[PDB]
Amino acid sequence: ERGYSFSLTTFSPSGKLVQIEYALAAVAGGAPSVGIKAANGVVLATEKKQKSILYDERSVHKVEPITKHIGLVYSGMGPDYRVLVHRARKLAQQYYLVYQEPIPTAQLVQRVASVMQEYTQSGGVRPFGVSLLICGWNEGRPYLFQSDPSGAYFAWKATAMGKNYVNGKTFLEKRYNEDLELEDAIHTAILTLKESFEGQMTEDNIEVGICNEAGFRRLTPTEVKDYLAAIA
């Protein structure tokens, strides 16, 4: 089994590619992130905690928009997340140029899944050590997707990956209901961040973005502080 956990183009005699599983293990060790799809919108959040407050939290953002209504969060490697954001922006804008219409999020997830599974096609190039959470609103429907280092993509009413993802998933399945409202969705997301935050979230310790009929927008620090106070 060890001789097959070294390349991405050799099948293990029993199962499948082991490098993909190791990339997934890299993903599961990343920063926790939770996305929740409410009835009228979607919310995705993550923890930005890092030692050495010397670090400029505003310098980098874990939640970025792809277009006016598509946003994404990750869990795992940072630079790979940035590269995925770049490729996703290029693909979405190519779709916009070809069709002159805002890119449906399902097609965006499919294309980003294809581009990341492209890195899994041959040896010499490691698969992305990053899993994506895609939030989007279109045709009067909020969409939430997860993109995998393996190139697999699936939908999610509400999920959470990264560190302590099993406990967060249990919390979500013990909290989420199909008739959830946007503000209550944000409350549930911040609570999910909390139950394994380990160190008293501040306004800048976490980062949360929201998408709805009015497009996608990452919440400003003031609204984050207000929501944190409301939850307390």
Binding site: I66, Q93, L97, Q100
Partner: peptide, 16 residues
């Protein structure tokens, strides 16, 4: 115009 608008939107989103 659409080409430059898309490229410039990408530029702005990368910059913020």
């Amino acid at each position: 115009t659409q080409l430059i608008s898309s490229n410039l939107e990408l530029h702005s989103l990368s910059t913020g």
